[PDB]
Amino acid sequence: PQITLWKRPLVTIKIGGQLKEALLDTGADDTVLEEMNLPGRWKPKMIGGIGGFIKVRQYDQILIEICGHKAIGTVLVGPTPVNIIGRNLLTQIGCTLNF
Amino acid sequence: PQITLWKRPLVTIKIGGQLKEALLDTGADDTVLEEMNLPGRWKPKMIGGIGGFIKVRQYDQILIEICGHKAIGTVLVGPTPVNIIGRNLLTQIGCTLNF
Ligand SMILES: CC(C)[C@H](NC(=O)[C@H](C)NC(=O)OCc1ccccc1)C(=O)N[C@@H](Cc1ccccc1)[C@@H](O)[C@H](O)[C@H](Cc1ccccc1)NC(=O)[C@@H](NC(=O)[C@H](C)NC(=O)OCc1ccccc1)C(C)C
Ligand SMILES: Cc1ccc(S(=O)(=O)NC(=O)Nc2nccs2)cc1
Ligand SMILES: Cc1ccc(S(=O)(=O)NC(=O)Nc2nccs2)cc1
Numbered sequence A, B: 001p002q003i004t005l006w007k008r009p010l011v012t013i014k015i016g017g018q019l020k021e022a023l024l025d026t027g028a029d030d031t032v033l034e035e036m037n038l039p040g041r042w043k044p045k046m047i048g049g050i051g052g053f054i055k056v057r058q059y060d061q062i063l064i065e066i067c068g069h070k071a072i073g074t075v076l077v078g079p080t081p082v083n084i085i086g087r088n089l090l091t092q093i094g095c096t097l098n099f
Helices: none
Strands: A010-015 A018-024 A043-049 A052-066 A069-077 A096-098 B002-004 B010-015 B018-024 B043-048 B053-066 B069-077 B096-098
Touching: none
Parallel strands: none
Antiparallel strands: A010 A018, A010 A052, A043 A052, A052 A069, A096 B002, A096 B096, B010 B018, B010 B053, B043 B053, B053 B069
16 A cells, blocks of 8 residues: 555564564564464574564565565564564565655 | 665754754654754653663654654654654654555
8 A cells, every 4th residue: 555654554464374463664674573483494693673682583585475465585583572574575565665 | 755675764864953864664653863962851761672672861842854854743862773763753744655
């Protein structure tokens, strides 16, 4: 769509044959999702934000669908309290900020 | 104008006399800038994200220019490593996500 920001920009995502809600985030370099089993091998990673760092597992070339828009790319899993769609995936669905 | 997301969506702001860069951040509720000098009476406030939380200072009715769009709102001030423009001002300047 064209989505307003009066309300948080949380959309429906599909990943792993599971439906989740996530936040379209121009403030995130990377896509980080709450704890979930996922296929293939991973590598260790840290991400930072407000008030420090946390550890995550990087998985590559993952199929995700975001309001019906398919993308394959990197997805990180760990103790985020919010499912976040970051720029690496927002680009793949054509997402822009406009005003 | 249009901001595609291949790089961090950075923009020029003008606030309390000064020129700065700040990130347009759709997953930020509030606006939060690096330590600076704003006027008069402020209240404590707590904001958190990945990894933890910070203590900030809340300044209300602060005037700000964001990419030539004027806005008046709550600016938060504290130890964030990046200046963040949140939905509180993104809404005032007519900012939406398009895909
Ligand atoms: C989502 C992350 C992957 C993202 N991180 C990155 O992309 C980082 C910079 N990149 C990165 O880590 O890459 C690898 C790296 C980096 C540096 C060194 C080595 C390796 C990030 O945290 N980005 C944040 C900005 C930032 C950048 C640098 C440093 C510090 C902060 C926000 O823009 C991003 O949009 C998040 C989303 C979020 C929110 C909550 C939990 C988890 C994620 N918002 C926030 O952190 C904001 N918090 C909020 O908006 C919350 C929801 N509000 C809040 O506390 O409100 C009051 C409240 C109080 C009490 C209860 C409830 C609410 C903040 C900017 C205002
Ligand atoms: C676009 C899109 C379709 C379907 C999903 S799904 O139902 O969550 N799971 C999968 O497709 N898994 C996979 N199948 C083959 C390789 S990875 C997610 C995203
Ligand atoms: C459009 C635009 C003009 C001027 C500015 S300014 O010089 O940075 N600030 C102000 O003039 N006044 C205030 N700042 C804080 C409270 S009242 C900012 C934006």
